[PDB]
Write a protein that binds this DNA or RNA. Sequence first.
DNA 1: TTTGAAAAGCAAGCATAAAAGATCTAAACATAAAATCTGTA
Lengths: 439, 106, 483
Amino acid sequence: MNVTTPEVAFREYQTNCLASYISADPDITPSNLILQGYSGTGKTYTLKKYFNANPNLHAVWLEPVELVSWKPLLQAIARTVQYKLKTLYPNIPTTDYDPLQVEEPFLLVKTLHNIFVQYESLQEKTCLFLILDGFDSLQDLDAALFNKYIKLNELLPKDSKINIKFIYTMLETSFLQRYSTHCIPTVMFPRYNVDEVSTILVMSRCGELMEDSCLRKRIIEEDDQFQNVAANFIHLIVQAFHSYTGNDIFALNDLIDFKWPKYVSRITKENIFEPLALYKSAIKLFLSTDDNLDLSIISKYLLIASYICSYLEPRYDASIFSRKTRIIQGRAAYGRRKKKEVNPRYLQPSLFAIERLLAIFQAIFPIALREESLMKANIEVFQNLSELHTLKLIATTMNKNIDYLSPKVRWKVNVPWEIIKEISESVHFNISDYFSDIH
Amino acid sequence: SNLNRHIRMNFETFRSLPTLKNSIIPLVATSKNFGSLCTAIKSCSFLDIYNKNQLSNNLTGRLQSLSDLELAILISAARVALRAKDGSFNFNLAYAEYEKMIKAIN
Amino acid sequence: VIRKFTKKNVARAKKKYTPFSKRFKSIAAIPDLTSLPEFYGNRFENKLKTTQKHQIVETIFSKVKKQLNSSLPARENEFASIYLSAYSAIESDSATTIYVAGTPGVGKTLTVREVVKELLSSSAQREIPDFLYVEINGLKMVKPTDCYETLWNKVSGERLTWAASMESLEFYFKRVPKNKKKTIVVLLDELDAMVTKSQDIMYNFFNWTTYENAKLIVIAVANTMDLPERQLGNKITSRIGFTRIMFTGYTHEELKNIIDLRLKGLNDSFFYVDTKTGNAILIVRKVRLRMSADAIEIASRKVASVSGDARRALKVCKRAAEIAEKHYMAKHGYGYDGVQTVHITHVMKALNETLNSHVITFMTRLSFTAKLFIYALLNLMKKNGSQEQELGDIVDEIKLLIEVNGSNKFVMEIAKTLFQQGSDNISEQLRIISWDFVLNQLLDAGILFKQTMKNDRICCVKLNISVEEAKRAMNEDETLRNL
DNA sequence: TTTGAAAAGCAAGCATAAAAGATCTAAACATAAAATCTGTA
Ligand SMILES: Nc1ncnc2c1ncn2[C@@H]1O[C@H](COP(=O)(O)OP(=O)(O)OP(=O)(O)O)[C@@H](O)[C@H]1O
Ligand SMILES: Nc1ncnc2c1ncn2[C@@H]1O[C@H](COP(=O)(O)OP(=O)(O)OP(=O)(O)O)[C@@H](O)[C@H]1O
Ligand SMILES: [Mg+2]
Ligand SMILES: [Mg+2]
């Protein structure tokens, strides 16, 4: 094995494994190789480092997440293999094949056979590394797809000068553990710890931070010192938000990008050599994450009534809403005896009928011989209810081909408690008084 | 010897020669000279490093990568699921259990 | 133009669309189709030929194995019935359906082909008029409508698509007069394979036999006698008819006669065997070949008990000859380039490997982890009797069996391997080492069934094999039966 | 001011309706090579 092992920080074992498995000689190279790790574990980075440190190796890079389905992946394999072989050996006359003729895995076998037989004039046998970076990120994935790819090498010719070698990257452990009896060589990429995450963030971000335009305009408005400023900012970001992000390089990069100009704007002539004074000058940046971005009155009260109908049992409604004077002798409801133990708004909503929702809407809506001050259910109320179903603030048991007029169809609220809380605060309705006495 | 110990362990767990070959190949390939190869085959310490790496992304190894807040949310969800009859839970119940543990600790 | 998708591998045959009813202006315009150079049958073989550079050593058992290959002593009444019906319907120029059913290998296709051969010999003697024989096998068709493409191509020589072929055959059988026609005998083999949902093909083929001008003999070979009652309608069952011919599986005496007829000239005969190579010549040593009548009798009785299938009896005899020839070639070291007997021991060994089960001896040769999995699964079936066990319960019960028999010598040596792979730098694991490997291995073996679930704990697992043979394989192990 | 008692509420049990979705098929939408019609030269 004659190959270069690049120095990749905190991935020395993985780089030594890549040097063990990936070589230009097809006899001592596995037909399939798996890199497995979760998001941001530096799989793509160290494969890039290995192939740039060994430019004599011939690698083809594919992204299955851009191809979604199996047939575009087969067509992409044929197209990129043929284009790479065209630019690798320009002095070899080749018959071009259309990648859109590949519609089956067998058609891919036939097309690769036809592409590879016009290169037998080459002297040495040669690996062509086809890298499927993100195989399990394919959107139409099923369990039978990977078996075709790992048995694909047995159908290609054995004495060919060009020998395809598959390198896959996988995200999830369970998908990989589906195929464990195939005994494919695997290199695992465990998640970084917080010190490795901080070192990677410093060595990847301090150069871009210390030649940022905001810092360079701030120092003329008010190199190693700027490096220490950016590194101290990165360490403060890590210690403030490592519990929030976990060991996530991307999320911490986004937080650094959001909070760096607001940190730079608080830098004065007194703050540069005093990191503590600069930290108390910008304390509000390190206390909250800050990663975030007109309904009608009838629609608001219908949403409030639907939330009540979803999260209150209908046997007790007469013990809350009934207020009329009884000409006829009649006993109102006694009310609920025992409180609930679990807050019912933590659970999924219950389903109700239309007339119950209209009853509670009439009971909670704001207001003599010929007045009848209660609002009856006219067409504007039903139009607002239909729009509320259109926006999915309310929902039904059926999602497609809905019989709105069916008595079998029942309705539920589809908003969380914070949304109905802000809505009730917009119309000064005390919705929290309706749930205070029940648990 | 260490080689016979690793072969015995494979015999009682995997009983697969390709599984053993996949570990032996980077033991040979990462050796830089003949003395390093003889030391590597006498000690078989690279087989232990390989075995540790093959288990690094499982449920045990993924747990040790979690932050303290992630571990707290996972513990709260687990005890809510253990208290449930069907083992089901959501974000609200797990958050309620989490704030009960934070005020009980504080 | 910009397409929404492409069909770049379309392979379309050169088949015309116009049916036979528009081939001439009138019915009277139709010529005599027998005096037409394309009707009624009026290149790849050499590509599988090469030159032989050696001399194949045929040993003394090679002629026995060659004569025992599949390439009419027990079918007289079936032959006579089929031949009499076909002879009567051909010589009087009528159309009929003959129905034949039976289990595999009972001589259905062979008897029908012999009947057709004898009818062709009788038509070559000018005792019955000429006819065209067509063989349509429903399992050799890609599409079921291709039989329409086949039969019409055998009749006219044209190549049409299937619907035009069906209209052409309908017009031919119904309207073309008998003086311009030839009789057609059609063998519809594997008749169940041409059964479709709409059953139009079955109706058309059996309804053309009811036409007065058809001159069509349809011999339908089936697998069950109750195929029209189970799968077909009343209309097709009425057209097939009440008379149906059953091909019973062979008794052991007829299998004995079949095997003796394949070995009439070889058995109890002498060969000149060359001891330098092994090549034997049928009439240097003079060696008599013998196969036992007791061996043939016990193989025939076994086969007649199972199926009465002549393919199985010939294959059992050929396997016994192969076993004896392998032992003979091993003991003499001959290669491929005074009495040789194939005995009842070879016949019993041929009969035993088809009746031996590898499932128990597969399970007894697994690793300790797979056997521990199966043992814990059987323990959970004993505990609750559900017959489907969640995988998390299997994990917990494996852990329980490890921590309960902890003072056992083998278990206290296995625990570090199972949970840390013999390494101090490896944390204690929630699954045992090779848990996924033995789970997937038992799934690929077909020992296990696993539901399609994404939560690994509540996913259920079921035995696909019988429980008592799993228990026998578990009690075969030394460690598991002691704890 | 009491009474008490009939209405209201709780709760275990169990048959049953219904939600969710696995599996599948019809129909609209779409492409295409060979054959066949069609208006001229
Ligand atoms: N060892 C490292 N040294 C330096 N920088 C690193 C290292 N590992 C990761 N990084 C940085 O983190 C970035 C994210 O890593 P990378 O894209 O390789 O992750 P991944 O595991 O392939 O992710 P995904 O599955 O989301 O594609 C890299 O582009 C690089 O800037
Ligand atoms: N009476 C017989 N005499 C000699 N050989 C026979 C006889 N019957 C069957 N065989 C042998 O067995 C073979 C199987 O017979 P055949 O093809 O007719 O079976 P079948 O009933 O059509 O079965 P399947 O339903 O499987 O097609 C024959 O080709 C021949 O070698
Ligand atoms: Mg990546
Ligand atoms: Mg047959």
